């Protein structure tokens with residue numbers, strides 16, 4: 001008719017680069033550098049598409065035995081306590 005099946009891994013992960021669910025409203029992504037399997041909108045400084053694994057449902061990435069994020073669950077070396085955004089601190 002118009003299109004056979006889904007287009008490309010690029011439309012998929014582009015759905016990631018953006019924010020809100022573009023193609024697969026429920027698809028899940030597993031970056032094995034932060035050890036997190038989560039839905040598309042992980043905003044906090046998120047690893048690349050270089051070690052990342054995609055699925056239709058999190059029941060798979062769980063059947064994998066990975067970390068279920070449905071609450072873009074944050075974590076930077078104690079976020080509340082410490083910080084230092086840059087490395088220009090000596091005076092003042």
Ligand SMILES: [Zn+2]
Nearest residue numbers: 038042069072
């Ligand atoms: Zn998340």
